[PDB]
Amino acid sequence: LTESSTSKFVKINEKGFSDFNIHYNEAGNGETVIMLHGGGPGAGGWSNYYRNVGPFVDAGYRVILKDSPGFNKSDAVVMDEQRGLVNARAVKGLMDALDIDRAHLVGNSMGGATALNFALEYPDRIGKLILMGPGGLGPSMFAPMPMEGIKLLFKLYAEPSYETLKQMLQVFLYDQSLITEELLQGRWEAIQRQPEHLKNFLISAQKAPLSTWDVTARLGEIKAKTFITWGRDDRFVPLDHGLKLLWNIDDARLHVFSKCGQWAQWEHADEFNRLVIDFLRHA
Amino acid sequence: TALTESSTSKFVKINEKGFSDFNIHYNEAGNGETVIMLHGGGPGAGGWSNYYRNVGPFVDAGYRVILKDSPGFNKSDAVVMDEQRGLVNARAVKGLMDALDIDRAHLVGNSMGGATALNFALEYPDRIGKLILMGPGGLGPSMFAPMPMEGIKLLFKLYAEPSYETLKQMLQVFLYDQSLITEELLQGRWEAIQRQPEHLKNFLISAQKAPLSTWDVTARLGEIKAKTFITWGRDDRFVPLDHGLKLLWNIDDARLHVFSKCGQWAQWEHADEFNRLVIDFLRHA
Amino acid sequence: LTESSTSKFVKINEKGFSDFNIHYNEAGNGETVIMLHGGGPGAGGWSNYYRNVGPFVDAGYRVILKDSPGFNKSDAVVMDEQRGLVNARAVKGLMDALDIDRAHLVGNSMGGATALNFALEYPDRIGKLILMGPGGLGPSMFAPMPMEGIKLLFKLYAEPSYETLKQMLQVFLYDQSLITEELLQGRWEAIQRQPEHLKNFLISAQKAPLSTWDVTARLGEIKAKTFITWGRDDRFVPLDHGLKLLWNIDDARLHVFSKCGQWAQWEHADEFNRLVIDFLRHA
Amino acid sequence: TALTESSTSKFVKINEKGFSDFNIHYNEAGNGETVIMLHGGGPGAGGWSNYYRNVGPFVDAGYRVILKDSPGFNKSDAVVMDEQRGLVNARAVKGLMDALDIDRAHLVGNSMGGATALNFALEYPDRIGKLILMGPGGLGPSMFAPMPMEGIKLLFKLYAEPSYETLKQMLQVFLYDQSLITEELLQGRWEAIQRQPEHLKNFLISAQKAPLSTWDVTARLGEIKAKTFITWGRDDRFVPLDHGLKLLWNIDDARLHVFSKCGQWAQWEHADEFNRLVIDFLRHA
């Protein structure tokens, strides 16, 4: 598989959306797994998930790497509501657009915020919920906020340098020497090719700051089977949120990877793949 | 051969440091790559009783499984120990491996058996493959939980005044869903208590000589070179959840998995998931 | 001072209350400190606070040891709403009853739940907020619930034995050999003399379980200056709630006492007294 | 006499283990019962710079206050250390106490000075009264926070490439309210960096010989017999909050106090409350 071969578009008309173009990548057939990416500059379905799409297809799954409204080759937008609840509507849109009655969601960071909102609003349309260091769960009992990674993320949004992006990625990864060009250019090309997303994000962050995303009091309402993954060394979202989810969602389990940043799916691909595939297959 | 507690039951004399001609009971099945499972420290614990829901699937996955009765438990020989039990138990595991000609084994350890597995990986790094830990005991204070924990107090209470009803109370604290407690489980533990009452008294004499605080190997976790799978039950009232994080941070190559709606026996209360996760870890980690 | 010398009653008519008799003890003059006791069988203003009333009066404070609706010499009742919100109304009642325009609150356990609700509903009537291991803040990130102390509390409510009460107190105190008769009889006489409170409590616990008391999502609304105290070895409410309060209340500080159970005010009287007096005097 | 940085400034030669005729700078005022205050480990740190908001009130409360410049900081003599800095610093504190005929002192320690205070209480239990710790360094891994922490990375960055703007970045991470950072604070630290650049390079050479992981005294906290007051800033990005709990659980007689809206300098960012709480602890604990 490649990005080219899998590339695809489709408009959506849910709630406040209307004739809104969502880019995505699709492969495989059958049961549907929608993978939702992180909030960083130049973030996209493919870029977040290029080590998990193949193995998930082989497992006999319909794999949808969605570009969320306002990133990569999807359409630009400005939100005055918390992006989790908004991205969920975009997801609900792409499912209605493509006749998908139900899907499993895999949400990393902002994505995980999306999946959590999707699961809260549209429970009848979610199968199983995989969360990987999801944002927007309020304050940590230990980490002061903003966290080091979030600081760097806004710094990159503000002054998109090549050297800055690099330093953002050295904080996102536990092992910094794992930095590939195919990754680094994937993000750097994505920021350049649509620099309207950057300014749109900062404005939205002004209208709905991270503190408004907190869905914590509603967690006792999530019914789907939940698999929470965390990188032990995540400098973007604090480890103790993993526990908050475990205690509040009725049916959850938590897996933490050592020597791992915010990208468990990337930095620990193999283990992540087989752990999640098995969770879908057997839980 | 049918796989039953009796058809798998075996004995081996071990000779290692402070053990001479010491009879160790174990249950064994399967062939090839070896997994040794080490049980908890409560009255009447033993290998079969802790691991009977795991043995079949591990054997079917192609492992040789050894459910070891630790010294001073169940059908192994009696002992009063004057050193910390994790280390003495690890000597016995090594003794059993030498006696059975086993060069390397994966270790699965629950509670006291987790402490055993950790001491074994510290002392005998060349003889361990992978390490699987389920809520290991004796890792010092918790950052949140007052000690002794509720499970620990019931453990000592049962050791000192054994009764069926106190056994039942203990087991109700050990498990998240107390309605899963069968009369057969209970009667198995109760028979082990009644058939080997010397183990209880010897345990109490030994704990006075080397209290639980002496089992703390925290300072050495940095030496462990085995790939490690830590499992915890979210609802464990015996050893606290923050110890799972302590191991995750101090062992070089670890992952942690926490089961919801689970007390201190994840291998038993969530056997199917446990089996699937650990088998997968042994095969592909 | 003694219980006799300070004993006093007054009816109240707030919201659902009407001609409802609140017992309390008062001493001293000037600025008002209302001390609110814990949820245990035979719990009462005096019994919780007999080492803190004298020293607080000397400090020049008006000290009100309130018996909460349904304990000790106050009137019996059954609640179908979480007792924190209900006890707050009773407190708001005793203040209107006695022409108190403002007060500082000192809440231990159930009391702390009260103070937190009082501070949320009636902020204009609260000065400064002292919380000592307050209940009803949801699940712990570490302790499974119900906690050992809560289990024992309901066991004592169910079968009020003298030996049972004793075992409840051995779990409430870090140092068990500190058990005094003047305490033990204070509780044992209180349970006997009004055994209707016991059954009323169990029914209310049925109508509004501990899980309904959680005010966590509203903590960002508390404006009063807050002093959170905790016993390190508290087996009734988990230590990590101390942190939750610290992070969520806008103006808070946290003090933890070593070798200390649920009764910081009792087990560490001196240090507690001077710490709180100074907080009132200078914060 | 007026109390100013200069009117209080003194030197004393110390001779203790690996120190011979080693000049220690300190600031001193007041008389009687002795409190020694030990500073942090960042570039340009020193006693005055860390504690100038505390000295007046402690002296007025009736204490003799000593703000000590640790070896290889500020106006004390230069040194490249080959052992963990907490212990070497504790030797220097003991050396200063012997040279000034001080039998017993209360110790207040911030960050590196907290590590110093802990080593001193371990090694010289008879020479300490009470122990006050503010976010002490080197207590090993955190259960929540990735390491090195953000403050630590800025510390090493500033040591290796000193610049005024990097100093400002560091100080902005140290403090909760960055708008409290005065030009005078900045210029004081910056002058100490520029006037003693050898301290920076010596610090880096020393940290290669005994890294921060070697400062961990966790395993010994159980030996500390001093009544201990632990203070933390909720918002500390240099040493993590769970270490406050680690000390609370492992030292026999401790209390913990956490200030909201506070980074790693509680003594400075919340001086008034800090002063009031610690003075009260010294008088009545």
Side-chain angles (χ1 to χ4, degrees):
Chain A
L1 286 172
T2 48
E3 203 288 318
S4 305
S5 71
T6 319
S7 208
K8 271 127 212 175
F9 303 83
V10 63
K11 293 192 155 43
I12 68 189
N13 300 275
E14 178 59 20
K15 294 262 190 174
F17 283 96
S18 148
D19 269 301
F20 194 100
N21 202 22
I22 298 299
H23 173 247
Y24 62 120
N25 298 45
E26 178 163 10
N29 200 235
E31 226 166 49
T32 329
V33 174
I34 297 157
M35 305 188 179
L36 307 172
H37 64 77
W46 183 260
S47 173
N48 267 223
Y49 288 116
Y50 80 88
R51 293 170 173 179
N52 321 94
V53 59
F56 271 72
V57 176
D58 301 19
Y61 285 104
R62 184 188 177 181
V63 164
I64 285 160
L65 312 200
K66 178 185 193 321
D67 286 349
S68 255
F71 287 83
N72 207 49
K73 285 133 61 171
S74 294
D75 285 341
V77 51
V78 168
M79 316 192 185
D80 64 57
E81 269 177 310
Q82 59 109 321
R83 314 182 73 89
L85 180 51
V86 164
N87 284 315
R89 279 156 186 171
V91 167
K92 205 258 218 199
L94 172 146
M95 280 165 54
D96 293 29
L98 303 171
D99 305 299
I100 312 178
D101 294 1
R102 213 190 263 279
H104 307 306
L105 298 188
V106 176
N108 167 312
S109 188
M110 179 188 89
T114 313
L116 274 167
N117 281 289
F118 192 105
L120 284 165
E121 301 303 336
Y122 308 133
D124 304 308
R125 307 286 301 275
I126 191 165
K128 291 162 175 176
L129 185 59
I130 295 89
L131 306 170
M132 330 167 42
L137 300 184
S140 165
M141 272 176 17
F142 289 100
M145 272 154 209
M147 292 207 59
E148 182 183 353
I150 296 304
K151 274 148 62 157
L152 277 165
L153 168 142
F154 282 104
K155 174 171 172 172
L156 191 60
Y157 269 122
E159 44 185 314
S161 163
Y162 158 94
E163 200 204 29
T164 296
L165 174 63
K166 207 145 198 160
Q167 261 140 301
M168 195 190 55
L169 297 187
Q170 287 160 27
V171 166
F172 283 7
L173 292 174
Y174 173 78
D175 187 341
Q176 323 199 336
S177 68
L178 297 181
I179 197 59
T180 59
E181 313 307 342
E182 293 193 319
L183 183 75
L184 187 144
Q185 306 313 335
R187 303 289 284 218
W188 179 245
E189 291 165 24
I191 295 158
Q192 287 193 335
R193 285 156 140 71
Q194 292 106 58
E196 64 277 9
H197 286 316
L198 277 38
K199 190 44 160 67
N200 282 322
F201 186 88
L202 296 182
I203 296 165
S204 300
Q206 292 287 351
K207 293 156 148 293
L210 275 289
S211 55
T212 62
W213 302 19
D214 190 13
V215 301
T216 285
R218 291 193 62 201
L219 292 167
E221 311 175 8
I222 288 189
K223 301 290 98 195
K225 287 189 219 306
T226 313
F227 185 49
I228 314 158
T229 66
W230 229 278
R232 183 192 72 184
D233 314 277
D234 189 336
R235 278 167 195 267
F236 195 96
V237 292
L239 191 53
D240 69 301
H241 285 164
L243 294 175
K244 192 151 78 172
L245 285 169
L246 193 59
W247 282 103
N248 285 297
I249 296 177
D250 206 287
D251 184 286
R253 72 274 304 122
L254 167 67
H255 197 92
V256 185
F257 297 84
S258 197
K259 293 159 133 55
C260 187
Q262 179 46 84
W263 297 337
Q265 86 288 4
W266 191 86
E267 193 156 25
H268 285 260
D270 298 331
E271 187 171 10
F272 175 84
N273 288 335
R274 68 180 156 75
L275 279 164
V276 177
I277 287 154
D278 194 81
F279 174 68
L280 294 172
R281 283 182 178 153
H282 295 98
Chain B
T1 298
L3 200 172
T4 62
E5 180 171 10
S6 176
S7 68
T8 58
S9 179
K10 287 163 196 212
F11 288 86
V12 68
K13 293 296 187 61
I14 64 160
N15 294 283
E16 174 53 55
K17 192 150 167 163
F19 293 108
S20 174
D21 263 83
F22 191 85
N23 215 17
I24 292 292
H25 176 254
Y26 62 107
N27 297 85
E28 178 181 66
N31 290 282
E33 186 170 336
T34 298
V35 180
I36 296 173
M37 306 194 179
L38 307 166
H39 61 75
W48 194 261
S49 67
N50 264 216
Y51 292 108
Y52 69 101
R53 295 186 174 173
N54 315 104
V55 61
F58 277 70
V59 167
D60 193 57
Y63 293 101
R64 177 183 178 183
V65 177
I66 290 171
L67 317 182
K68 181 181 187 297
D69 288 357
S70 284
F73 283 82
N74 201 40
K75 293 171 188 195
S76 292
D77 282 352
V79 57
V80 178
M81 298 182 187
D82 64 349
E83 297 169 65
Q84 61 104 337
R85 194 174 287 275
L87 176 62
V88 170
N89 290 353
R91 288 170 189 164
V93 170
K94 200 236 181 197
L96 165 155
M97 285 169 71
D98 288 347
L100 294 176
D101 296 332
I102 295 170
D103 295 322
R104 206 182 287 290
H106 307 301
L107 294 198
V108 178
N110 177 46
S111 150
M112 171 182 77
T116 308
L118 283 166
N119 283 269
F120 187 90
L122 288 174
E123 301 288 327
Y124 313 112
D126 46 312
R127 303 293 294 283
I128 188 152
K130 298 175 178 190
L131 187 64
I132 298 98
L133 298 180
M134 303 107 268
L139 297 158
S142 171
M143 302 298 95
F144 306 92
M147 295 194 169
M149 289 206 77
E150 198 186 340
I152 296 289
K153 287 144 62 158
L154 277 160
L155 175 142
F156 278 92
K157 182 181 176 185
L158 182 61
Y159 262 113
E161 31 178 42
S163 81
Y164 179 86
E165 63 199 299
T166 310
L167 165 66
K168 197 170 205 150
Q169 289 170 34
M170 185 179 82
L171 290 195
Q172 286 171 355
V173 174
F174 284 18
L175 307 175
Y176 176 71
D177 186 348
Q178 311 165 11
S179 82
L180 299 186
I181 287 164
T182 64
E183 272 305 313
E184 292 66 57
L185 177 61
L186 271 168
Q187 289 302 320
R189 295 287 293 240
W190 179 238
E191 277 164 25
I193 287 162
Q194 282 199 328
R195 288 174 137 214
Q196 291 92 9
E198 69 287 356
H199 286 335
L200 272 68
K201 184 47 174 159
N202 289 351
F203 185 93
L204 283 180
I205 297 167
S206 305
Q208 285 296 308
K209 296 181 183 267
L212 187 59
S213 58
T214 71
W215 298 22
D216 190 7
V217 295
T218 289
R220 301 185 66 199
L221 293 177
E223 311 179 25
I224 288 167
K225 313 183 289 249
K227 298 190 103 69
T228 298
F229 187 98
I230 313 149
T231 76
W232 229 270
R234 189 190 73 179
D235 311 283
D236 191 335
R237 299 172 174 264
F238 189 85
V239 300
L241 195 52
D242 66 302
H243 287 175
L245 295 176
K246 188 147 93 148
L247 293 160
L248 182 62
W249 284 106
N250 283 287
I251 296 176
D252 179 51
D253 187 357
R255 65 283 295 140
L256 172 70
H257 193 104
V258 186
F259 298 91
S260 168
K261 301 172 171 146
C262 184
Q264 74 198 67
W265 289 351
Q267 85 285 356
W268 182 93
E269 302 171 67
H270 289 272
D272 185 59
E273 313 178 54
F274 178 91
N275 289 343
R276 199 151 26 78
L277 294 165
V278 178
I279 290 177
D280 196 65
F281 170 75
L282 297 175
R283 281 175 168 157
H284 306 118
Chain C
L1 286 172
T2 48
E3 203 288 318
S4 305
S5 71
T6 319
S7 208
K8 271 127 212 175
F9 303 83
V10 63
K11 293 192 155 43
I12 68 189
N13 300 275
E14 178 59 20
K15 294 262 190 174
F17 283 96
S18 148
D19 269 301
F20 194 100
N21 202 22
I22 298 299
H23 173 247
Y24 62 120
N25 298 45
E26 178 163 10
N29 200 235
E31 226 166 49
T32 329
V33 174
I34 297 157
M35 305 188 179
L36 307 172
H37 64 77
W46 183 260
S47 173
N48 267 223
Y49 288 116
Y50 80 88
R51 293 170 173 179
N52 321 94
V53 59
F56 271 72
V57 176
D58 301 19
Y61 285 104
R62 184 188 177 181
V63 164
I64 285 160
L65 312 200
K66 178 185 193 321
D67 286 349
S68 255
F71 287 83
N72 207 49
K73 285 133 61 171
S74 294
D75 285 341
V77 51
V78 168
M79 316 192 185
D80 64 57
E81 269 177 310
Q82 59 109 321
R83 314 182 73 89
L85 180 51
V86 164
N87 284 315
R89 279 156 186 171
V91 167
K92 205 258 218 199
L94 172 146
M95 280 165 54
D96 293 29
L98 303 171
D99 305 299
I100 312 178
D101 294 1
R102 213 190 263 279
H104 307 306
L105 298 188
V106 176
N108 167 312
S109 188
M110 179 188 89
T114 313
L116 274 167
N117 281 289
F118 192 105
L120 284 165
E121 301 303 336
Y122 308 133
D124 304 308
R125 307 286 301 275
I126 191 165
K128 291 162 175 176
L129 185 59
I130 295 89
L131 306 170
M132 330 167 42
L137 300 184
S140 165
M141 272 176 17
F142 289 100
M145 272 154 209
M147 292 207 59
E148 182 183 353
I150 296 304
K151 274 148 62 157
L152 277 165
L153 168 142
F154 282 104
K155 174 171 172 172
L156 191 60
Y157 269 122
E159 44 185 314
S161 163
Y162 158 94
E163 200 204 29
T164 296
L165 174 63
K166 207 145 198 160
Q167 261 140 301
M168 195 190 55
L169 297 187
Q170 287 160 27
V171 166
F172 283 7
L173 292 174
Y174 173 78
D175 187 341
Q176 323 199 336
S177 68
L178 297 181
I179 197 59
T180 59
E181 313 307 342
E182 293 193 319
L183 183 75
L184 187 144
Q185 306 313 335
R187 303 289 284 218
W188 179 245
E189 291 165 24
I191 295 158
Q192 287 193 335
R193 285 156 140 71
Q194 292 106 58
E196 64 277 9
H197 286 316
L198 277 38
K199 190 44 160 67
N200 282 322
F201 186 88
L202 296 182
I203 296 165
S204 300
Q206 292 287 351
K207 293 156 148 293
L210 275 289
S211 55
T212 62
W213 302 19
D214 190 13
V215 301
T216 285
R218 291 193 62 201
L219 292 167
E221 311 175 8
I222 288 189
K223 301 290 98 195
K225 287 189 219 306
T226 313
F227 185 49
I228 314 158
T229 66
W230 229 278
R232 183 192 72 184
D233 314 277
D234 189 336
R235 278 167 195 267
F236 195 96
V237 292
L239 191 53
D240 69 301
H241 285 164
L243 294 175
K244 192 151 78 172
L245 285 169
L246 193 59
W247 282 103
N248 285 297
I249 296 177
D250 206 287
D251 184 286
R253 72 274 304 122
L254 167 67
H255 197 92
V256 185
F257 297 84
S258 197
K259 293 159 133 55
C260 187
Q262 179 46 84
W263 297 337
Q265 86 288 4
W266 191 86
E267 193 156 25
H268 285 260
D270 298 331
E271 187 171 10
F272 175 84
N273 288 335
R274 68 180 156 75
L275 279 164
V276 177
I277 287 154
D278 194 81
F279 174 68
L280 294 172
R281 283 182 178 153
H282 295 98
Chain D
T1 298
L3 200 172
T4 62
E5 180 171 10
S6 176
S7 68
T8 58
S9 179
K10 287 163 196 212
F11 288 86
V12 68
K13 293 296 187 61
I14 64 160
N15 294 283
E16 174 53 55
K17 192 150 167 163
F19 293 108
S20 174
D21 263 83
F22 191 85
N23 215 17
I24 292 292
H25 176 254
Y26 62 107
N27 297 85
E28 178 181 66
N31 290 282
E33 186 170 336
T34 298
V35 180
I36 296 173
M37 306 194 179
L38 307 166
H39 61 75
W48 194 261
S49 67
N50 264 216
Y51 292 108
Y52 69 101
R53 295 186 174 173
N54 315 104
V55 61
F58 277 70
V59 167
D60 193 57
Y63 293 101
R64 177 183 178 183
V65 177
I66 290 171
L67 317 182
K68 181 181 187 297
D69 288 357
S70 284
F73 283 82
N74 201 40
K75 293 171 188 195
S76 292
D77 282 352
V79 57
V80 178
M81 298 182 187
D82 64 349
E83 297 169 65
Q84 61 104 337
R85 194 174 287 275
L87 176 62
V88 170
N89 290 353
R91 288 170 189 164
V93 170
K94 200 236 181 197
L96 165 155
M97 285 169 71
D98 288 347
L100 294 176
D101 296 332
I102 295 170
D103 295 322
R104 206 182 287 290
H106 307 301
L107 294 198
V108 178
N110 177 46
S111 150
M112 171 182 77
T116 308
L118 283 166
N119 283 269
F120 187 90
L122 288 174
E123 301 288 327
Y124 313 112
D126 46 312
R127 303 293 294 283
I128 188 152
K130 298 175 178 190
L131 187 64
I132 298 98
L133 298 180
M134 303 107 268
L139 297 158
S142 171
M143 302 298 95
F144 306 92
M147 295 194 169
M149 289 206 77
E150 198 186 340
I152 296 289
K153 287 144 62 158
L154 277 160
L155 175 142
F156 278 92
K157 182 181 176 185
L158 182 61
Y159 262 113
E161 31 178 42
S163 81
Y164 179 86
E165 63 199 299
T166 310
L167 165 66
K168 197 170 205 150
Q169 289 170 34
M170 185 179 82
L171 290 195
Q172 286 171 355
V173 174
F174 284 18
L175 307 175
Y176 176 71
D177 186 348
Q178 311 165 11
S179 82
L180 299 186
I181 287 164
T182 64
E183 272 305 313
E184 292 66 57
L185 177 61
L186 271 168
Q187 289 302 320
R189 295 287 293 240
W190 179 238
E191 277 164 25
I193 287 162
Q194 282 199 328
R195 288 174 137 214
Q196 291 92 9
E198 69 287 356
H199 286 335
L200 272 68
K201 184 47 174 159
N202 289 351
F203 185 93
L204 283 180
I205 297 167
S206 305
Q208 285 296 308
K209 296 181 183 267
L212 187 59
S213 58
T214 71
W215 298 22
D216 190 7
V217 295
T218 289
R220 301 185 66 199
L221 293 177
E223 311 179 25
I224 288 167
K225 313 183 289 249
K227 298 190 103 69
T228 298
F229 187 98
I230 313 149
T231 76
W232 229 270
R234 189 190 73 179
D235 311 283
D236 191 335
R237 299 172 174 264
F238 189 85
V239 300
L241 195 52
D242 66 302
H243 287 175
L245 295 176
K246 188 147 93 148
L247 293 160
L248 182 62
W249 284 106
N250 283 287
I251 296 176
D252 179 51
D253 187 357
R255 65 283 295 140
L256 172 70
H257 193 104
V258 186
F259 298 91
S260 168
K261 301 172 171 146
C262 184
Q264 74 198 67
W265 289 351
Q267 85 285 356
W268 182 93
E269 302 171 67
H270 289 272
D272 185 59
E273 313 178 54
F274 178 91
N275 289 343
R276 199 151 26 78
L277 294 165
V278 178
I279 290 177
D280 196 65
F281 170 75
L282 297 175
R283 281 175 168 157
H284 306 118

